[PDB]
Design a protein around this ligand. Structure first.
Ligand SMILES: Nc1ncnc2c1ncn2[C@@H]1O[C@H](COP(=O)(O)OP(=O)(O)O)[C@@H](O)[C@H]1O
Ligand SMILES: Nc1ncnc2c1ncn2[C@@H]1O[C@H](COP(=O)(O)OP(=O)(O)O)[C@@H](O)[C@H]1O
Ligand SMILES: [Cl-]
Ligand SMILES: [Zn+2]
Ligand SMILES: [Zn+2]
Lengths: 380, 383
């Protein structure tokens, strides 16, 4: 297994089959406790909780008295990232017999949604209890689960109420990617490509090479009794952990974290308009394409560089323009006026944007100051 | 202005009239921001918010842009220390124009209730924003506001959901004690006496001396224009800050030192679980100290003379020393506390023995932590 230290500690454990042969075991020995609370939605749970309850029983049998495994399932969707669901899980935990104590270890089994909710639930339960991250979406494995940022949503916006509570462990089991819907896998790929583009040319080239292969496995129908990523196993692990590693690196450090926002400046503006029909990664993809175009316009990025960005994103199934087909269909031709975008970008004179002087090489070691008029030029 | 440092840094500012001449000023200069949110109940607010709005305007006038002061008032009582109340305070914060942001400085103006709620609201607002403590109750000045422990209550218990969020500043304005109801003042005195009893025989001795005087000012009519603690001003500040200082000390100490802060609380908590909400926390802890002291004596660790002074000193301040005290009896229609019930409530605290803070003498703890004691030995003092 591959370990990626984060914040001066071992937190991340990444490899195939962790949820089957490792997690349970490791939790009982490194996260000693009498109460383990697994949280997940009905989609990912029905697929993975059974194998775990069993794997759990085997490890708990050897310990006495036997540690209990409590499970909580919530409806899928970001509808659970609410004040209501959090209170529930809390009252449910307090209603257990005996009530779940401060020794509780919470297991966040899911994506960004389950992740933020559970992480925040843990941070405040009796003023905080330990918890581990078990990212099931690609976007969660390389980004959302690394960092400790947790929160829920309110009818006035996303992530408005939450906390920064570092998970004790972060289990990255690449096998979760075997059942992850194709669209979701592609969505996460945006951040992976983003990470490379702001840190390593060689890594961005690896992504360029592997694209065809990865996408073949991600789409090919897999007959029961086989692994979706049969021969590409090592390639996938390398490309995905590279991103996770970077996120972990940045999180362990000032202006280095701003770079994690490349493509997000414009990206966020687009999403504010096209969500929830269009996904985060899908919007960031178009965001990277434009911010790259902005870098070119400002004379900081070369034409050749800009093309590969687009080419590489497309190669993975990500949208590169607001004019894309799918997007236009999924959003019945919604339109992002150059103004509404500049309005949104401000909801966050001049704008701060991450510019690239070349693939793998950031212009400044932080978000560069850019003038509005210069931004408005790449928004059409 | 006397300053006490907590957790390796200044935070506590203690003196008279801070709410009138200091707070506002200091907030604008040391807690620079565009949004300040004052939270309080309708009891303490109606008495103190007006003078503050004004004091605020004066300081904000010089600085430009103008730092806005938003105010939130909730019904008094621990009924506001709820998920709902917290949620409103937040939606209200997000609904302002423009919405309260991460630069926000929250002002917790009130007692333990307002303190815990606001402190917790702050800890999670956009994943955390700065906040200051402005303890208006005695119990809050020397205990609840020092430490960073925040939370709300749920129908299944107190302080079940919350967080540990250290306040940026802790303004201890002794003038709040001029309007604090007599009962509340006496309530807080329990913890002050507790602090002394576990750290300084001298400090305890002074408490015994200053009693008769303090209680005179607390229980007297103050004609218009006169400060309630006219001549005793320095005495009060000394006695009160001594406790606050200790709390600050323990809280900054890098284990069992925090256990000592639980003296009288072992039995004390058991009693409160039964007699609350009619009887207050301090009032229950008082009886708790009396009994735990009796337990120490029984176990041969505390002398008879020592135990007496404890009782005498608590009484001297108007605190109950036994469950048979008439004031209690009245407030609880004579509710009974079975030893069985008390021993059970003491177990709800996560066997054959209970851990209790024992004193070998006033100011001197037996062990540097909660000593292990057998059930039968505890049951004897309760009978
Ligand atoms: N490994 C997986 N296999 C199957 N379904 C999954 C997996 N991961 C999550 N899902 C489902 O996919 C959708 C997207 O997960 P979500 O947590 O919303 O994504 P993100 O982390 O991008 O916010 C949800 O409907 C969820 O139940
Ligand atoms: N400085 C003060 N003077 C007058 N009223 C106050 C003051 N402090 C708080 N109060 C009121 O006194 C009561 C006790 O405050 P609370 O915070 O509930 O107590 P504690 O801190 O002991 O838990 C409340 O009804 C409150 O509105
Ligand atoms: Cl909360
Ligand atoms: Zn992102
Ligand atoms: Zn107490």
């Amino acid at each position: 297994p591959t370990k990626i230290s984060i914040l001066g500690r071992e937190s991340i454990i990444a490899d195939f089959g962790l949820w089957r042969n490792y997690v349970a075991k490791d939790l009982i020995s490194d996260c000693s406790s009498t109460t383990y609370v697994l949280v997940t939605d009905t989609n990912i749970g029905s697929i993975y909780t059974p194998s775990f309850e069993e794997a759990f029983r085997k490890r708990a049998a050897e310990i006495t008295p036997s540690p209990r495994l409590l499970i909580y399932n919530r409806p899928p969707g970001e509808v659970s990232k609410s004040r209501q669901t959090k209170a529930d899980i809390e009252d449910w935990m307090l209603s257990q017999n005996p009530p779940c104590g401060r020794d509780t270890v919470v297991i966040a089994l899911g994506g960004g949604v389950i992740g933020d909710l559970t992480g925040f639930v843990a941070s405040t339960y009796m003023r905080g209890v330990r918890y581990v991250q078990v990212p099931t979406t690609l976007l969660a494995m390389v980004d959302s689960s690394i960092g400790g940022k947790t929160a829920i949503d309110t009818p006035l916006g996303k992530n408005l109420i939450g906390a920064i509570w570092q998970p004790t462990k972060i289990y990255i089991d690449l096998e979760f990617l075997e059942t992850l819907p194709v669209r979701e896998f592609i969505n996460g790929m945006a951040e992976v490509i983003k990470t490379a583009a702001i840190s390593s040319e060689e890594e961005f080239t690896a992504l360029e090479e592997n694209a065809e292969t990865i996408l073949k496995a991600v789409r090919r129908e897999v007959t029961p009794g086989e692994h979706r990523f049969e021969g590409t196993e090592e390639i996938l692990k390398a490309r995905i952990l590279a991103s996770a590693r970077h996120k972990a690196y940045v999180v362990s450090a000032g202006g280095l974290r701003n770079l994690l926002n490349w493509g997000h400046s414009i990206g966020h503006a687009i999403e504010a308009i096209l969500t929830p029909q269009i996904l985060h990664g899908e919007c960031v993809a178009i965001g990277m394409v434009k911010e790259a175009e902005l870098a070119r316009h400002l004379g900081i990025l070369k034409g050749v560089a800009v093309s590969r960005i687009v080419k590489c994103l497309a190669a993975y199934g990500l949208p590169t323009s607001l004019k894309d087909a799918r997007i236009r269909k999924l959003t019945a031709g919604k339109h992002c006026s150059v103004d509404q975008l500049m309005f949104n970008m401000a909801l966050d004179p001049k704008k701060k944007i991450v510019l690239l002087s070349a693939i793998g090489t950031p212009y400044e070691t932080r978000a560069s100051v850019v003038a509005n008029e210069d931004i408005r030029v790449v928004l059409a």
